[PDB]
Every structure is written in C-alpha cells, then in structure tokens.
Amino acid sequence: HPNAATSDVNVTIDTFVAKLKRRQVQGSYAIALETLQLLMRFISAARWNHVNDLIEQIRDLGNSLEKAHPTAFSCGNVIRRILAVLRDEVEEDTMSTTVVAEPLISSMFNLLQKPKTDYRQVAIQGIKDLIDEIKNIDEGIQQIAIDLIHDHEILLTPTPDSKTVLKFLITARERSNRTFTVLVTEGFPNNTKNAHEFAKKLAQHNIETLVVPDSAVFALMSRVGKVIIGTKAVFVNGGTISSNSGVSSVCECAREFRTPVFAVAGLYKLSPLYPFDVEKFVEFGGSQRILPRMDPRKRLDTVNQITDYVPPENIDIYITNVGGFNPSFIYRIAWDNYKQIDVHL
C-alpha cells in the first residue's frame, strides 16, 4: 500500500517520517504523543463506509509506519492498543447486528470453532484514554515503589536516561524516615552527560551521591543491595530494550552476586511483538565521538552501540501503573491491551 490515497486528506505522515529519520523527535513519550495525534487526524478527516476495510487500511498504515522506523516501539504499541479497542466494539456490534459462552475473559477453542453504529465516538474516546494513561505513570508506581527500599541499604543505578526512573528515585528520597546511599554508573559513549545531570539532580535533592566509573563496579559489589534499570521498551517473554549503554554487564554482575534486579517502565512501552533477534531491533551509534582523526581511523574500526538488550533471566520485577508484575506474567498484561490478530500487520 502506497501514499497515493492520502495526499490532501492527510499530509502529516511525511512530517512524522521526517521526524523519525533524522531524529528531530526525541523521547519515546513524545513519539507516542505524535502517533496519537496522527491517529486522531486520520479519524476526524477520512471516510469509511465499511468497517473491515477501514481496519485493513489502519493495519496497512501501521505497517508502513513500522517500515519507516523500527526502533519506535511506542508508536506501534499505541496503534495496536487502538486497534484492540476498536475490535472489541466491532465484536459487540456484530452480536447486535446478527440479532455465546466462555469460561474466562478469552478462549482458545473459539478460534478453532466457526463463529451502522456510533463506534467512531468510542474510537475517539479510546485515544483520549490512551493519552491520559501516557500522562501519568509515576502516580500508579509510587504506591508500590516506596515499599522496597529500606534504611542503611545501598542502591546501584545503571541507565539514568529515563525520565520515569529519576522521578521514582525522587519520590523514594522525599520520605524523611528513609535513608539510602546511591551508586551511579556513568556509561561512557552514550550516557555520560545524562549521568552527570542525574548526579547533579541527586545532589540538589540533598542525598548522598557516589559517581562511579564503568570499571569500578566490581569492587563495590559486596555492599550493593538493589539494582534498577532505566529501560525504554518492554516485550513478550520478559526481555527489555534499555535507554543506551552500560546495562548488560551490570545486570550480569548482579545475577552473579544474586542481587535483586528491578525494572520500572510502563505498559505503553510494552510490545506484543517478540524480540527474536538482538541485531534487528538494536540500533548502533556513532564512531566520530570516540576518537579524533580520519586517515589513521580507516585502520581503526571502532564499535559503539546506542540501545542495550538484557535477557529476561536476570530481571525479576516489572512495577507499572496497575501494579507489580513478573517477566513470567507480563505477556498476559500485553494480551489484555493488544488482541490476537493485531500482533501481525
């Protein structure tokens, strides 16, 4: 499906693509917001007449968006959620149009056995709901989050790039009765400035801050109590894509020492697609930032990557806005938000 049908009806797709390609848009939240806006635009302006055809068109659009940018998971996720929202309503409608038993909320045997309305408003409302959900995640985490950290315990923080994780930390630090020491890993080629900023923020907040280089993780590990990840995207089996540099090794270390590994992200970051390949989804950074000169640097081929992938075996906890979950359970949450056919587009 090409962009021959959408030219004067919807123009913003091109702009979105541009934003994606040259990285004019920054932060997954912003991307999600943009996607939502696009969806709204599609809904308010275009014509349908039929429902299945419309659904197909939407699917095609989603596919196109995916093809334009693979590292933008939030965009995909939101679309999927919207589709799911549509789908249930459609199913409900069909039952009235025609004019059923189930043990649970969803059935497996229903796939094997042979099975005009104001749905537009409902669809519109769905988008609004999604927006609302996106707006506040930290408020639904803090009631569970400020129960884990105790007095005279030491925290270790890889990936300070995420905006949620910092907030979570701050909320914990607010409490007068609670006291903890913070060890911060830098992350050289991608996270350094961000890490520094985080450290500064911590200092401002009036907490004991310890800036640790990437090599000095091993010596302090006898005192480490907990591990927190600043992840960017959540998946099916448990595996997560983290917000750039210095996460994997630390996680491995934690696993070795049997240190508890926590993860805070959200359900809008959660994807119903499987991360079958690390090489396909993980994007690599820039060689220019590491070392100067060009003519001797033709011989010196430098390897540097943005995003990081951590196996589900190391991570045990996934606290979101709903509540505390596991990597062995999060799949069901995704299913509760994205339907069966909506996985493949």
Partner: peptide
C-alpha cells in the same frame, strides 16, 4: 598496534554485549 600495522577493533567497558 597501529605503529606495527595490525587489524584493530576498538571498544570500551560498556560495549561488550554486542562485541
């Protein structure tokens, strides 16, 4: 290494999961 003429990859402490 360069002064000798060897095929060199250059990495850091963080970049190890992909190398």
């Amino acid at each position: 290494l360069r002064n000798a003429g060897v095929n060199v990859m250059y990495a850091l402490i963080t970049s190890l999961d992909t190398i």
